[PDB]
Design a protein around this ligand. Structure first.
Ligand SMILES: [Zn+2]
Lengths: 87, 129, 144, 146, 81, 150
RNA sequence: CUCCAAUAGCGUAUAUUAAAGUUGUUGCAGUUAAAAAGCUCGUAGUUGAACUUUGGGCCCGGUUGGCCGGUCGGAUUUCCAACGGGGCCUUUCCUUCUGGCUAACCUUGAGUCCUUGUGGCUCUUGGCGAACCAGGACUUUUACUUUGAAAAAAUUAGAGUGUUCAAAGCAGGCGUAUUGCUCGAAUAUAUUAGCAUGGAAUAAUAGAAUAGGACGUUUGGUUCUAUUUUGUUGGUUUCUAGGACCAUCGUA
RNA sequence: AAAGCAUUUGCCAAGGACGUUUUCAUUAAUCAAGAACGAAAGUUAGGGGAUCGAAGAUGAUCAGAUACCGUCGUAGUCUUAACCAUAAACUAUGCCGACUAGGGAUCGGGUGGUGUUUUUUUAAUGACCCACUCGGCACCUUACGAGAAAUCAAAGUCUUUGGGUUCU
């Protein structure tokens, strides 16, 4: 969102849930920012280099947070043969 | 009984956006539902949808991509003169600068914005945002 | 849903249903029954002149314990007898029997006011002058 | 409807000022006068070759078609040489933005050149006052049930 | 849940669903080719048959109607076609 | 749900996704027609020709192997009934209740259930007059109801 | 006594509008606050599943099809189809016989004026129907929507204008103020019904089932009719042309 | 359908659910007017003999007791024949349609099992067990949602306010 001259307004741009594509509000205290280590040969998790997922507090209350990360991480190559599209 | 299949379809979509789903299955399907989903698709409100061919009426599976707040139907389909459209967009759209009211003109099913530049009017179907 | 018809060819039902349920409204009924003309003591008028018949003392209802110093008046144009309150003190001395007072509503559009039971009217003018003037000694009551 | 032998009334039914001279033999038994009613309306073959008189007929008569051209559905044919049509319409009530169904009955005069039953979407045309209530004559007949 | 393939459900789920509640509805019944002991002719029998079907020859019994599938009588070899 | 009860059952047939006969059928499209009219001349209704043909002769359903519905074959052969079998079996049930209620008229439920059946007769005969299946008035009467079933 | 509010005005009464989403089409409420008929049938009324084809051009996105691999089974996209989609500028219309009428040449017919001449105008001989005349129509009717006309003035919104301001009013303003020049007095709204016009989505309606179905470039027939024409008018018939009706054959 | 309906047995018609590769093809939903059916309870004329209390008869209790308590008793849920149709006629929740959540029971129907049991040796059914499914009376846990709250899987999908329709 911007004015006529392209100057930015709207003092912050909010995070969005990576499962349901909805806005994380400033008062969603059940929302969670998952940080996953990136790894290289012979283990040795690289410090400070992540794969990050955000989950809204709606999803976690519904009990869908586990099934969401199984989809969210299998599509990124973090898992294999754990989440199945066809139920 | 079923009075309008468009109201059922838009109720099904609206219930699954709320729950967090990424797909719906609606039944039955009609040309009006196909065109209404096509107007929703070209503005980016829904993803891809596939039409399953029964021999009866067909079903549709529609992929949802978040970013949809409400799709609703207006019943009855009121007649809308070309000067009454800004009385509807002011009533049931969240702001003057996004959102669409889908009408049914003799030039076809279309949202209110390019009914204006086509300079046509007709009956009202509903709204999306 | 919503219990009312919605079809596009159903304007008659909505219009007749609005009409039937208008009668539950208090002032719509009185506008269309003519209750002001037939039933109200004034003939649907803000004011009416009368003739004083007697001085009355009405006990104020709870939790007040005063005597309210009103009068009983018979109107000219109708002949009906109403009770009207005589305002702030000493005015009951300024009113007497057969003074041809002028009456107004007592504020609440046909209802009693305050702790006075069953009085819907007040005196404005007595003998044709005022009560404010007589109370403030601005005018004098005619010798009658 | 029904019909009868044309000379059924007390007066001799004739087409006024149409003189068939008895002194000279002529093939046609009577001389007929018919007119084109106008407004793109075909005069039926029944009028040109028939034997009714009907001074109020749009064709072959004393009546001109001018004014409005209405159309309705025939609801009664009990009267003689006239019928009642039912024009239905929708009336808009702006407070509710809905409609209500309304109707009107228009008594129209039917010639003995058409045959009209209940049903029968008929196109009628305005003329001068024919009687207390009728101001219209039937001009075209279109059957509804086939 | 919240992400499913509604165009390709697994065959187990479609098999355990009701007949009309599948993605496309269809019959769960079939037709049977039965051999009565008497003659050797071809007789086609509905699995949920309602009439007491008999052969064209010697017409004994081939099945008895029930509230479900027809009960095929004592031993007559059956195929499913 | 049901028209005259609160039941909400969905039990029904389910036609397959095929407008063609199965590959194993291979009788003919015409010998079935002779078998249709053989049963009709025995006074069989279209509902009970189809159950007889499916159970014994292995036709899945008579439209997909012929192109015609069953009573269109009967009507083309001149074996159409006077009134539809849909309406005939409603009248026969109404005559059966009337005969029952004639002699023990203490059944307040057979008087109730008669009303539901007769209402269904009137709704269905209204439809048949509109689509010109029945003559334009035809006026189902109770006193002549028993005459039509036999 | 002091202070507050409005002020040449301020209080009181009755009515009415807002408040009032406390009349609810927008837009109320009905388990317990007021309110779901004891229950079911049922006519009017209201409402009612799905289904019937995409011609102008230019710019944009993909999705398939290859000409193309750059490369250790996947990695970029461009020139070309059309494949529907999108934005623009625009096409676009009426589907017919009788001739009126041809608008232009399909003409090039005989050569001319002027720079070596398709630079350049008059033109007959078949030869352009849309540019509209009058006949048949196209022929199932609507609802709906677009545009247009026609809609008294005053009131309303509103343009101009220093009535000294303003409410107003429709005036006025500039010279050479000596013998005159000139701008104004707009525009909008005016629904429902009627009229004229474009659209063909939505929602109805009709069609061919005992075929009395559609076409006809087939042949037998019946009746009605009389425009031109044999000068004439009227009576008749030869042919012509036109309906209507009855058989047969053809087509799909 | 409601009011309502419980040991037999036979007649007489009716009905939901289920199964169905049967048949018709929109015949449907809700419904002013108009109708059918209604707990009990006295319009109204055999019979059979009170356990209950109006009242009444009575005995207590009490300041009084015309009431509660005790004994008896006529009218008064048994005829054969109507209510005009009134109930806290209640789920104080109209009817039809669609969607949104997890579970374990149970009633009826159906499908499956190299299941158990009944005996002929298992067989055939029956009864049972496991799994699934359709349709019911319900229940348990939560609250994305609703509500003024109590609470509610509908009383949710409602200021992001429109599925159809009746009544108040
Ligand atoms: Zn055999």
């Amino acid at each position: 969102m911007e004015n006529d001259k392209g100057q930015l307004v709207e003092l912050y741009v909010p995070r969005k849930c990576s499962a349901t594509n909805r806005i994380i509000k400033a008062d969603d205290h059940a929302s969670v920012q998952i940080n996953v280590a990136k790894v290289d040969e012979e283990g040795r998790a690289i410090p400070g280099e992540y794969v990050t997922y955000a989950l809204s507090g709606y999803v976690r209350s519904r009990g869908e947070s586990d099934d969401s990360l199984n989809r969210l991480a299998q599509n990124d190559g973090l898992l294999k043969n754990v989440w199945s599209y066809s139920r | 009984t079923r009075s309008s299949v468009l109201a059922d379809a838009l109720n099904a979509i609206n219930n699954a956006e709320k729950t967090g789903k990424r797909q719906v299955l609606i039944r039955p399907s009609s040309k009006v539902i196909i065109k209404f989903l096509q107007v929703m698709q070209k503005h980016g409100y829904i993803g891809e949808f596939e039409y399953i061919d029964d021999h009866r009426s067909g079903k549709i599976v529609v992929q949802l991509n978040g970013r949809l707040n409400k799709c609703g139907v207006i019943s009855p389909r009121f007649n809308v003169k070309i000067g009454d459209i800004e009385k509807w967009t002011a009533n049931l759209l969240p702001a003057r600068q996004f959102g669409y009211v889908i009408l049914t003109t003799s030039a076809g099913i279309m949202d209110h914005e390019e009914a204006r530049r086509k300079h046509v009017s007709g009956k009202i179907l509903g709204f999306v945002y | 849903g919503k219990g009312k018809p919605r079809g596009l060819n159903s304007a008659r039902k909505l219009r007749v249903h609005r009409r039937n349920n208008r009668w539950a409204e208090n002032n719509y009924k009185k506008r269309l029954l003519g209750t002001a003309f037939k039933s109200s003591p004034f003939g649907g008028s803000s004011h009416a002149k009368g003739i004083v018949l007697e001085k009355l003392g009405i006990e104020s209802k709870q939790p007040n314990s005063a005597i309210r110093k009103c009068v009983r008046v018979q109107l000219i144009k109708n002949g009906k007898k109403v009770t009207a309150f005589v305002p702030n003190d000493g005015c009951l001395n300024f009113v007497d029997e057969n003074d041809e007072v002028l009456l107004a509503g007592f504020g609440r559009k046909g209802k009693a006011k305050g702790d006075i039971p069953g009085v819907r009217f007040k005196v404005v003018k007595v003998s044709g002058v005022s009560l404010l003037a007589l109370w403030k000694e601005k005018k004098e009551k005619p010798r009658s | 409807s029904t019909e009868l032998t044309v000379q059924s009334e007390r007066a001799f039914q004739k087409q006024p000022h149409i003189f068939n001279n008895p002194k000279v033999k002529t093939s046609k038994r009577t001389k007929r006068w018919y007119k084109n009613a106008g407004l793109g309306f075909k005069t039926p073959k029944t009028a040109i070759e028939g034997s009714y008189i009907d001074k109020k007929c749009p064709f072959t008569g004393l009546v001109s078609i001018r004014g409005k051209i209405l159309t309705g559905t025939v609801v009664s044919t009990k009267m003689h040489r006239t019928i009642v049509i039912r024009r239905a319409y929708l009336h808009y009530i702006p407070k509710y933005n809905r409609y209500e169904k309304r109707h009107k009955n228009v008594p129209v005069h039917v010639s003995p050149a058409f045959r009209v039953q209940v049903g029968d979407i008929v196109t009628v045309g305005q003329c001068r006052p024919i009687s207390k209530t009728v101001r219209f004559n039937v001009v075209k007949v279109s059957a509804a049930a086939g | 849940v919240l992400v499913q393939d509604l165009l390709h459900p697994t065959a187990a789920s479609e098999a355990r669903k009701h007949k009309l509640k599948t993605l496309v509805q269809g019959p769960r019944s079939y037709f049977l080719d039965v051999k009565c002991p008497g003659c050797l002719n071809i007789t086609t029998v509905f699995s949920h048959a309602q009439t007491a079907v008999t052969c064209e020859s010697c017409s004994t019994i081939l099945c008895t109607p029930t509230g479900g599938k027809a009960k095929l009588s004592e031993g007559t070899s059956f195929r499913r076609k | 749900g049901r028209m005259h009860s609160a039941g909400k059952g969905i039990s029904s047939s389910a036609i397959p996704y095929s407008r063609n006969a199965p590959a194993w059928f291979k009788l003919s499209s015409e010998s079935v027609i002779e078998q249709i009219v053989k049963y009709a001349r025995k006074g069989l209704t279209p509902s009970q020709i189809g159950v007889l043909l499916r159970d014994a002769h292995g036709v899945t359903q008579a439209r997909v192997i012929t192109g015609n519905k069953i009573m269109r074959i009967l009507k083309s052969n001149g074996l159409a009934p006077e009134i539809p079998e849909d309406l005939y079996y409603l009248i026969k049930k109404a005559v059966s209740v009337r005969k029952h209620l004639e002699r023990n008229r203490k059944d307040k439920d057979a008087k109730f259930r008669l009303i539901l059946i007769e209402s269904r007769i009137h709704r269905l005969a209204r439809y048949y007059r509109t689509v010109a299946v029945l003559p334009p008035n035809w006026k189902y009467e109770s006193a002549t109801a028993s005459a039509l079933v036999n």
